[PDB]
Structures are given as C-alpha cells and as structure tokens.
Amino acid sequence: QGLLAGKRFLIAGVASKLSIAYGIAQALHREGAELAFTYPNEKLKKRVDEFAEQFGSKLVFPCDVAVDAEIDNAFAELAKHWDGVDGVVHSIGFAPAHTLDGDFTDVTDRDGFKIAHDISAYSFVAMARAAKPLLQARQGCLLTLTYQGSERVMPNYNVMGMAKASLEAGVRYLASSLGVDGIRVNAISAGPIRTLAASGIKSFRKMLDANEKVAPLKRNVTIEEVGNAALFLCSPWASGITGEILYVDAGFNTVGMSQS
Amino acid sequence: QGLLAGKRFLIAGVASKLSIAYGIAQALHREGAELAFTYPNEKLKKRVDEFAEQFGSKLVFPCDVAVDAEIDNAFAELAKHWDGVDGVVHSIGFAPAHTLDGDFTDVTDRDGFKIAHDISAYSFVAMARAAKPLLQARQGCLLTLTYQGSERVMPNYNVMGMAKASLEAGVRYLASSLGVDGIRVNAISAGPIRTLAASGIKSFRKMLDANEKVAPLKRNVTIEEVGNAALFLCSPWASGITGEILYVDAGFNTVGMSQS
Amino acid sequence: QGLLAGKRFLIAGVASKLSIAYGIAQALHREGAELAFTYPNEKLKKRVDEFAEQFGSKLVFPCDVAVDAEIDNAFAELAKHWDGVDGVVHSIGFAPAHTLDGDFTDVTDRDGFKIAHDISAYSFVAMARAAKPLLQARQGCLLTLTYQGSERVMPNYNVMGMAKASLEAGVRYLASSLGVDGIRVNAISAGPIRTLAASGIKSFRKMLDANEKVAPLKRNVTIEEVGNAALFLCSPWASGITGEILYVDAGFNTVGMSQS
Amino acid sequence: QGLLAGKRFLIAGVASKLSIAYGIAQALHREGAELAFTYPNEKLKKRVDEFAEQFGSKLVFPCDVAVDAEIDNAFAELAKHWDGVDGVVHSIGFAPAHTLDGDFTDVTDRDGFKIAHDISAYSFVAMARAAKPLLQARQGCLLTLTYQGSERVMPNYNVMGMAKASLEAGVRYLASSLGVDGIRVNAISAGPIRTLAASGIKSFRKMLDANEKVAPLKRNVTIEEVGNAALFLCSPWASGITGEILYVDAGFNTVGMSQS
Ligand SMILES: NC(=O)c1ccc[n+]([C@@H]2O[C@H](COP(=O)([O-])OP(=O)(O)OC[C@H]3O[C@@H](n4cnc5c(N)ncnc54)[C@H](O)[C@@H]3O)[C@@H](O)[C@H]2O)c1
Ligand SMILES: NC(=O)c1ccc[n+]([C@@H]2O[C@H](COP(=O)([O-])OP(=O)(O)OC[C@H]3O[C@@H](n4cnc5c(N)ncnc54)[C@H](O)[C@@H]3O)[C@@H](O)[C@H]2O)c1
Ligand SMILES: NC(=O)c1ccc[n+]([C@@H]2O[C@H](COP(=O)([O-])OP(=O)(O)OC[C@H]3O[C@@H](n4cnc5c(N)ncnc54)[C@H](O)[C@@H]3O)[C@@H](O)[C@H]2O)c1
Ligand SMILES: NC(=O)c1ccc[n+]([C@@H]2O[C@H](COP(=O)([O-])OP(=O)(O)OC[C@H]3O[C@@H](n4cnc5c(N)ncnc54)[C@H](O)[C@@H]3O)[C@@H](O)[C@H]2O)c1
Ligand SMILES: Cc1c(CN(C)C(=O)CCc2cnc3c(c2)CCC(=O)N3)oc2ccccc12
Ligand SMILES: Cc1c(CN(C)C(=O)CCc2cnc3c(c2)CCC(=O)N3)oc2ccccc12
Ligand SMILES: Cc1c(CN(C)C(=O)CCc2cnc3c(c2)CCC(=O)N3)oc2ccccc12
Ligand SMILES: Cc1c(CN(C)C(=O)CCc2cnc3c(c2)CCC(=O)N3)oc2ccccc12
Fold first, then answer.
1. Cβ contact C39:C5 at 8 Å
2. Which of A202, B134, B220, C45 is the least buried, fewest Cβ under 10 Å from its Cβ?
C-alpha cells in the first residue's frame, strides 16, 4: 500500500530501459499502480511485452499514432480489461531526422513539418479523446512530455520547437475542455536526457555538457527525476493543478546567462 | 517620400478592406513603400488586382500556401522585377470552420489539425525560405500575425491556438536562422478585430464586447493601429528588434481580472 | 516512516488554522517531518506554541522579518537544536492596508511600497542567507508563496503585484546562487483562499466567485492542495526542480476568456 | 515638423551622451517634439542644462526621485510652462555598487534592496502620479526602461533583477489604472549598452561579448536603436499598445542556447 494503491495507468512511449516513459512507469509501479503499455509496431512488440512483464503487466497493445483506427482500437481493447483509468501518459515525439540536422530554414520541408506536428502534438489530443470515456470513469488525468525548445531557440531542435509549442497550447486547451469533467491535464518540460531520443543528433554530448554548466544545480536530470515529478502530477497530491507545464531541468530555463 | 521611401514590400493576405493585411498596406504605401500582393485563388484575383491598383502597383502573383510550387513560383516571378525586397508580410491563417465550433477535444480531428498547422504555421516558414535570396539583398525583414489564444485559452479558438503557438516558435527559429544575414523576423499579436476572420463564428460579437470591458484602454483595436505597428516593425526604427511578439491589443493580455 | 521520515523543516507564517503555512505544516508532519515554527510578535506566540504542540514540536521562535537581528537570531537559536535542516518554508506577505484599496496610482505611496517589498520579497532573501549554513548541511530546499497578481493585473492587489514580482525574481536569483551548494529554491503560486490575508479586502468575496467560474476545474483551491504541492517541492521527488514557480490555482492562469 | 510636431515630452535620466535617455531625447527632438528634462542634483545641473540647449530647450528642473517634494515640485514647476504633456520618459535605475558584485545571497542586504526598489521601481509609480494632470490634458503616455535580468538570471545583476521585475509589474498596474484616461504606459527592455550604468561592473565587457555571440543578429544594440523604439512607443503609431514590454535586444531573449 503506497501512493497509487489500486490506481491504473496507460503508458505510451516505452522504447527502451532508457525511455523517459520507462522512468515514469517505474516510479508509478514503485507506488503501487497497475500498468498498461502501447508499442508503435511489430518490431518493438517483444521488447515492450518484456518490459510490461517486469511491471507485473501483460496488457500490451498495438498503437501507431499515425493511424486513426490504431488509436481507438487500442482504447477499445483496453475497455475489455479495464473499467476506467486514473491516467494516460503520453511520451511520444518524432520528426524526420533531416529536419533536426542543419539550418532551420533550409531543412524544414512541408512533409517534415506535417510528420513533426502530427506524431508529436496532434497525437496527444487524439489519445485524450479516445481516452475520455475511460478517464471520466475515474476522473483520471493526462500527462505529456515537452521541451523548452518551444519557448527559446536551441540549435537543430528546429521544427520540433514548433511541434512542442503546439503540444503546450494543446495542454491548455485540453485542460479547459476536460476540467469540467474533473480531468486534469499537465506536462513536464524535461531537461535533455541521453535516451534513444538522442540517436543521430551530432551535437548531443556538447548540448548535455552545456546544460550541465548552465543549470543552477550543475547537473543533468535523470529519468528517475522526471519519473518522480510525473508520479506527483499523476497523484491526488496534484489535485489543484491543471494546464501546468512543470519544468524538471535542474533550473536551466531560469538562467539568462552563466559564468561564461 | 516618407519613412519607407524606395523600399519594397510584398503582402500575402489582403482579402477584403477589413483585412489586417490591408491596414498594413495602407500604412506602408502611406509612408512611401512600393508594394506587391498575392492572392490565394482565382475567385480573389479580381479584388486583389483592384486593391494593388489602389496602391499604385501591378505586382500581383498567385499564392496558395498549400502548394510548394506556387510559393517558389511567386518568388521566382517577383525577382524578375525586384532584385531585393525590404520585407515580406505574412497575414494568412486558416483552419476548417468545424474545428472552431464547440468543444476542443470533440472537434479536433487529424485533417483539421493538419490543415490549421499547414496553412497557419508551416506557410510562414516556407515563405521565409523562398524570400531568402530576395530578402538577403536589401536585408529586409519578415513579419507575421498572431493571436494570444496561443498563450491562454479562448472558447472555440481551439486548434488555431495550437497553430499560432507553432507559428510563434517559427518566428523565433527563423529569427535565429536568418539573423546572421541581417534579416529580422517579428510578429504582431493583435487583439480581436471584426474582419473576414470573424465569419461563421457565432460567439464573435459577445467575444468582442468582453474585450472592450477588460482592455485597459476600454475599446477594441483597428487595422490602422495594427498597420502602424507593422509599419514600425518594417522600418529602420525596428532595427534592434527581432524574434519579438508585439502585442497590439489595447493591453488586454495584461489583465487577470477586471471589475467583473 | 513515510516520505519525509527523519527530515526537519522550519515553517514561517502559520498565523491561524486557515493559513497556507498550516496546510503545509500538516502536509509535511503527515509524511513524517519534524517541524519548527516562527511567530511574528508577542500577541501570536501562544497560538503558534499551540500549533507546534499540535504537530509534535517544541521548536518555536520569534521572528519579525522587518528586523535583521530577529532573523540572524531565530536561526542562531535553531542551530542550538538542529545540526541541519531539510527546508525552510516562507509564507509571509504584507502591505499597509490602504495600498490594497482603490486606484493603484492614487494609493501607492513611498512608505507603502517600501513596506510591501521589505516584508513580502526581501524577507525571503534575508531568511535564505541566515538558513544557508543549516540548509547546506543537509542539501535542503527553500519554498515561498506567490500570487499571479505579479504577472497579470487584479483590481486592488496593486503594490503587492510589484512585491510578488520582485519576490519571484528573488526565487530565480536565489536558485542560481544556492544551486552549486545543492540547495533548491522554489515557489508555489496559489489560487485565492480565504485566510487572514483576505481580512480587510473589500472585494474578496467577488474575486473568489469569479475565480471559481473562470478556473478550468470550476472550484477554488484548498490549503490541503497547496500543502500537498509544497510537500512535493519539499521532498526528494522534486530533486530535478529548482527556480520554478508552481501554479496550484486549478488552471486559472491558463484562461484568456471564459463563457462570459 | 515631423511625427511628433508640437508634442511635449519630459525626459528623466540624461547623464551623458552615452545615456539611453540621451538617445531617446535625440530621437524625439529629431521628429519635432519640444523637450523638458530633469537633473538628479547640483553636480549634474551644468551638463543637463548643456544637453537641454542642444535639443533647443529651456525647461530644466531638479528631481531626486528619492525625495517626494522634488517629484511634486518638478511637475508643479513644469505645469507653469506647459498646460499639457504628451509623454513622460523615465530612464532611471540605481542600486548601491556592493549589491551588484558577487554572490546574490551574500551581498543583498536590506538597505541595498530598499534603495534598488525605491529609485528603480517606486520612482516610476511616483513620477506617474505627479504627471497625471499634465498627462490627462493631452492623453499622454509613460515609458520606462527595463532589463531582462528580471525574467532570467544574469550574474551580478542580483537585486536590480528583483527591482526590474517590480518595475515591470508597475508598468502593468499603471496601464490598468490610467488607461481609462487614454494614458498609455509601456517599457522597453534594452539589451546591454556601455553607459554610466556599466561603471564599476568589472564583468561588463565579457557580458557584451557573450551578448554579441548569442544574439540572433550577432551584434549589440545602440542608444539610436533604443531611441527609435522609444520614439515609436511615444507616437500615435503605438496608440493600440499599452502595458507592453518591447525587447530591443537583437533577439537575445529568444535564444536558449547558441553554438557552444
Ligand atoms: N530525451 C530528451 O532529451 C527529452 C527531453 C524533454 C522532452 N523529451 C520528450 O519526451 C518524450 C519521450 O522521449 P524519450 O526521451 O523517452 O525517447 P524515446 O525515443 O525512448 O521515446 C519516444 C517514443 O515515441 C514513440 N513513437 C514514435 N513514433 C510513433 C508513432 N508514429 N506512434 C506511436 N509511438 C511513436 C517511439 O517508439 C518512442 O517509444 C518525447 O516526446 C520527447 O520529445 C525528451
Ligand atoms: N481578425 C482577428 O481577430 C485577428 C487578430 C489577431 C491575429 N489575426 C491573424 O491575422 C491574420 C489575418 O487575418 P484577418 O483578420 O486580416 O482576416 P482575413 O480573412 O481578412 O485574412 C486572412 C487571409 O489569409 C488568406 N489565406 C487563407 N488560406 C490561404 C491559403 N491556403 N493560401 C494563401 N492564402 C490564404 C486569406 O485569403 C486571407 O487573405 C491571420 O493570420 C489571423 O489568424 C487575426
Ligand atoms: N491567501 C491567498 O489568497 C494567497 C494566494 C497566493 C499566495 N498567498 C501568499 O501566501 C503567504 C501566506 O498568506 P496566508 O494566506 O497563509 O495568510 P496569513 O495572514 O495566514 O499568513 C501571512 C503571514 O505573514 C506573517 N507576517 C506578516 N508580517 C510579518 C513580519 N513583519 N514578520 C514575520 N511574519 C509576518 C503573518 O503573521 C502571517 O503568519 C503570503 O506570502 C501571501 O501573499 C496567499
Ligand atoms: N546600460 C544598459 O546596459 C541598460 C540596459 C537595459 C536597461 N537599462 C536601464 O536604462 C535606464 C537608463 O540607464 P543608462 O544605461 O542610460 O545609464 P545612466 O547611468 O546614463 O542613467 C541612469 C540615470 O538614473 C539617474 N539616477 C540615479 N539615481 C537617481 C535618483 N535617486 N533620482 C533621480 N535620478 C537618479 C542617474 O543620474 C542617471 O541619469 C536605467 O534604468 C537602466 O537600468 C540599461
Ligand atoms: C535536446 C534534444 C532532443 C531531445 N528532445 C528534447 C526531443 O524532443 C527529441 C526529439 C526527436 C524527435 N524526432 C527524432 C529524434 C529526436 C531523433 C531521431 C529521429 O529520427 N527523430 O532532440 C534534439 C534534436 C536536436 C537538438 C536538440 C535536441
Ligand atoms: C478572436 C477569433 C478569431 C480571429 N482570429 C484571431 C483568427 O486567427 C481567425 C481564425 C480563423 C481560421 N479559420 C477560419 C476562420 C477563422 C473563419 C472561417 C473559416 O472557415 N475558417 O477567430 C476565432 C475563432 C473562435 C474564437 C475566437 C476567434
Ligand atoms: C486574492 C488576494 C489576496 C490574498 N493574497 C494573495 C495576498 O497576497 C494577501 C496580501 C495582503 C497583504 N497585506 C495585507 C493583507 C493582504 C490584508 C490585510 C492587511 O492589513 N495587509 O490579497 C488581495 C488583495 C487585493 C485583491 C486580491 C487579493
Ligand atoms: C548589464 C548590466 C547593467 C546595465 N543595466 C542593465 C542596468 O540596469 C544598470 C544597473 C545599475 C544600477 N545601479 C548602479 C549601477 C548599475 C552601476 C553603478 C552604481 O553605482 N549603481 O548593470 C549590470 C550590473 C551587473 C551585471 C550586469 C549589468
């Protein structure tokens, strides 16, 4: 009997033991929650199934967030097993690699933009709708993951900046739409973390190294720190908070410039 | 020969005389600039031609921002007459009227979101890339229009809130991208004005009357006021300003509660 | 042994059982913390002693933040009992009442401004330096209470808006200065609550009712909700978070307009 | 007869030909306005009278913003010459040197704090009250100067950051309080400039270089640039704009991170 005794949570975005989603799952499971998981396609099925069982779960559903059908069907199959749901965690973002490698103006094509926004922003709004029924049942909550490249420029984060800003406004629109029904909607803006969200990003070590120098606490956050703040936002302790973008960046966003 | 004597400006978005883009035109012509215009579709070629003739210009090109060829071609066409441009003004925004009516979570479907972001946000980035060689020659600037539904929730502004939030990040990324070449990128966040943008929005009237009671100046703003602001941002007086969102909203954004 | 087992917290500003500081005390004690308290003057000493007693504590001191020596003092006294502290909660805001009633420009006078800024903002900074040696010894945190009247205008909040804004900048400055030493500094920005901070405030009822209509959750926040949040920011669950203003306002801050 | 033909402006803060207020005075004179000036004390009377003569003006009054009488008297004295004023420009800020040098927590004492907020923030509210009759006659505007150190930590900027935060809040409360009289109140947030405000700030040059490398335009701003920005905000072209903070920093504020 810990903080989330008897509570249920769907977790979209486990790719690896390094995912932010995995730090969240683990913090939620630590506190007594029962877990469900999506996987984007066949190739990942077996690795996700595997992670689910590590959490006492065998509730593992196909969900590619590009396909309208895949979304509703995943929430449908989940209705069979679950009465309701205490939260939906969205840890999904993606842009074609090329849009994230170079000058913003040169490399930002229309398809790269469509994919960035569709997978990284619209999808949260879609999952939310597909999940409304199951969330009204328990007055659960939604959480997504954003990045402060929405507010301030980072080199090569590019169209993902625009997509996250879209996400953030989404959070607010959802919180206003769903609050009436007692559904809370929040986000965590996490500092950079070495996950498979770094693969193919040439600058990544040097980004991480700058963060470590600039941030008030002089260190980079972990998936355990993002997890624990996710846990809080997913728990009755966060009952007075909706439409919030909670920064978990060891204070980086607060610095206008560091000792050089 | 006033503030913009012998400077060249292209204006995407005049549709009627209510348009913010017309307000901007009037203001830029008034201070001695040479103008050029685009139109979205045939239906409109006619009235835009007139308006351009009204502004002592015959540089009018087709530009539906949905089509990459058309963006590329309007800028390939323009460079025949001008070997440098002093600013491009982006005053285009659109989402399907169904996504602007009712509950955010219920109405915001994939194609609806896709269109909003594509026309309202991507288009400005694409227009920036096309105007780059033309802009680079005179160190002109870019300007776009936004609305504060990006930052806080308005009823029924819905997905446009997201698209505007995307747009505003675009302003910032373009600014950092294009900055080394001395191209400045700015936007105006204007208060609500009754224009063709108001059409099909049942709530608009009462929406406008709330603004009147809340704004510090106790009145709505006009396309003149927005035009004069845009003129400033396109003038040598704005030379130390880029990446800025300028609020022309009678101070509405600054008020949390008004005598109720 | 719950979440704050074996941790120690000094709470400044419990004045009655409606207080913000009270819901915080109660939240930290519940989770195992041992508590210490200040009182502002002789006339409150008894109820605070009572309240400390309530929460298993005999650690209770005088501290008027107008007077440096009483700040140096109260921490010197505390060192006698504690060799290190896991956090100091500052829940203290005052302005002479005539500054909080009527027109901002008419009523904001030099002494009124001084006082508001002295007690409400400088005091967090004074307490921080005095607590530095003791916080350093356990890598504890700091927490203050702010209100959104800093960011957006509210009717007679007036010079307290200037105070809280100065305070919030305080939080950021403190965060960078104390982060190298592992000390996290945060704020909670609470929605409005009827407490002794309402007690003189002519339009308080009207605001509480407006707030409730505008908030996406359609209710006011409680001291239990602000308490649970302070607890979070005061716990190892918030290790990755510093310089943050957390909004526990039921989403109020995110609403531009609500059905009229 | 330019844009401000036969308008009147009081300018508070001219110290040298390096001063922001000096760059402001030059821009408003350039475009036709008649000017008046305040000097802080006797040592300055000489140089201020000289500059006043440069921009063709006799109207020169003493004004130490620490002292209530001299504010009141300077505006009393002004009223004898002018029957209305079109705007008042407040380019004043001061903290004792010791607060601006080293660790924030260590160096920020009560008296340094009070002085910071009193000359930097209060002074504006005070000047606004006394200028009210004069501003009401002509529906004139106010303008102050701020620095982004309010929103994000600069090293050594320290208490001036708290005071600029408070000043910015004042801008918004003033705008709400005076809007009803058609009085606009705005600020410019300038990027750093070498002026007398850089005296004894040993870090200053390294700061200016950091600004140059990070800013999208890759250069620092000038008093001519802040001057023109101020001109615009003091002009009929800004009639739709109140309670605004206009950044004139070459986009510095929009960058989260620059190439290492
Ligand atoms: N790693 C960081 O530095 C960092 C910091 C802040 C925020 N974020 C954000 O947090 C979230 C989590 O990323 P992460 O660091 O855990 O990396 P990750 O790559 O492990 O997680 C991203 C997930 O999105 C999934 N995904 C991609 N396309 C999909 C589709 N079409 N349908 C369904 N799922 C799809 C991937 O399978 C993957 O599981 C992302 O939104 C990311 O942008 C990351
Ligand atoms: N009217 C307001 O209340 C208000 C306030 C602030 C900002 N804005 C923004 O200002 C901008 C202009 O709006 P307005 O009030 O002047 O209304 P408007 O309807 O007069 O102008 C909108 C323009 O965008 C053009 N457009 C639409 N789809 C297009 C496409 N596919 N290709 C090319 N062009 C296309 C339209 O033809 C029209 O010229 C929009 O971006 C809007 O979001 C409007
Ligand atoms: N109540 C609300 O609506 C609300 C909302 C957001 C933030 N806040 C803030 O939270 C804090 C706590 O207020 P509250 O609502 O619990 O009311 P409260 O009156 O119970 O607490 C305010 C405390 O300030 C103390 N205080 C005043 N002058 C002092 C001095 N010179 N020295 C030492 N202590 C002094 C009082 O004793 C009191 O304990 C304040 O900073 C307030 O601005 C209040
Ligand atoms: N220089 C920069 O880097 C920079 C950048 C952004 C904003 N600012 C702000 O712009 C404003 C103008 O400063 P500046 O940089 O031109 O430097 P400056 O030193 O020339 O101007 C400061 C003025 O304030 C006056 N002053 C100080 N105490 C006073 C008092 N008690 N009563 C009356 N007047 C008093 C000084 O005599 C001087 O005229 C300041 O508020 C400053 O904070 C400066
Ligand atoms: C930080 C940071 C991140 C981490 N982060 C916050 C992210 O949001 C990750 C975003 C991301 C989205 N799509 C893809 C990839 C990364 C990598 C490979 C791929 O094919 N698609 O990504 C960056 C990309 C460029 C610059 C900085 C960053
Ligand atoms: C204010 C305001 C506006 C004006 N504004 C700032 C806008 O950005 C306009 C947006 C808009 C985008 N697409 C369409 C329409 C309007 C009308 C009809 C149509 O078919 N498509 O629109 C609102 C919509 C709902 C609520 C408020 C507003
Ligand atoms: C909400 C709200 C509050 C609560 N709040 C957030 C506060 O910060 C309270 C501030 C406060 C500061 N000083 C005094 C008082 C209240 C009451 C009586 C007194 O003598 N001095 O105060 C308001 C004051 C005016 C308008 C709204 C509010
Ligand atoms: C930039 C920058 C400035 C310029 N700026 C934005 C300012 O607002 C100036 C502030 C200031 C206020 N008071 C005093 C001084 C400067 C200098 C000497 C003195 O005796 N008093 O000041 C800094 C101070 C420390 C760090 C950076 C900066």
1. no
2. A202
List all residues 6 or more positions away from D240 whose beta carbon is below 8 Å from its beta carbon.
B190, B191, B221, B222, B225, B226, B228, B229, B248, B249, B250
Does residue A91 contact residue A48 with C-beta atoms inside 8 Å? no
Give the active site residues of A: 147, 157
Q: How far is C146 from chain D (nearest CA, A)?
A: 13
Please report the residues numbered 172 through 231 in chain D whose beta carbons come closer than 8 angstroms to any beta carbon of chain C. 172-178
Residue B252 is classified by DSSP as G
Token representation of residue A96: 């074609």
Q: Give the residue whose CA is nearest to atom 16 of ligand 6.
A: B197
**Sheet with B245-248: strands ordered across:** B60-62, B34-39, B8-12, B87-90, B141-146, B184-190, B245-248
Instruction: Flag whether residue B256 sits within 8 Å of chain C, measured between CB atoms.
Output: yes
Cβ of B200: how many Cβ atoms within 10 Å? Answer: 11
Q: How was this structure determined?
A: X-ray
Structural gaps in chain B: residues followed by a C–N separation over 2.5 Å: none
Cα first-last separation, chain A: 49
The alpha carbon of A157 and the centre of ligand 5 are apart by a number of angstroms equal to 6
Distance from CA of B236 to the nearest CA of D (A): 8
Q: Of B230, B253, B229, B256, nearest to B151 (Cα)?
A: B253
Kind plus residue range of the DSSP H or E element containing C89: strand C87-90
Q: How far is the CA of A100 from the centre of ligand 1 (A)?
A: 14
Three-state DSSP class for A191? coil
Q: Helix (H, G, I), strand (E, B), or coil: what is residue B157?
A: coil
What would you report as the CA-atom Rg of chain A, rounded to the nearest whole angstrom?
Answer: 18
Phi and psi at B145, nearest 5°, equal -110, 135
Residue from B51, B7, B145 nearest B89 by CA: B145
Active-site hit among B22, B39, B122, B147: B147
Look at ligand 7, atom 19, and give the residue with the nearest C-alpha. Answer: C97
Rounded alpha-carbon distances, angstroms, from residue A28 to A23, A35, A142, D167: 9, 8, 14, 43
Q: How many angstroms is the resolution?
A: 2.3
What is the distance between the alpha carbons of residues D72 and D249, in angstroms, rounded to a whole number? 34
Crossing angle of helices D68-81/D123-138, nearest 10°?
A: 20
Q: How far is Cα D204 from Cα B223, in angstroms, rounded to an integer?
A: 43
Q: From the centroid of its chain, how far is CA A84?
A: 21
Token readout for A163 is 């997509």
- Residue-level length of chain B: 260
The beta strands (E) that lie in A4-105 are given as 8-12, 34-39, 60-62, 87-90
Residue that the structure tokens 């504690």 belong to: C82
Angstrom distance (rounded) from CA A168 to CA A150? 8
User: What separation in angstroms does the CA of B215 have from each of A38, A67, B146, B221?
Assistant: 47, 44, 18, 10
CA of D95 to the centre of ligand 8 (A): 8
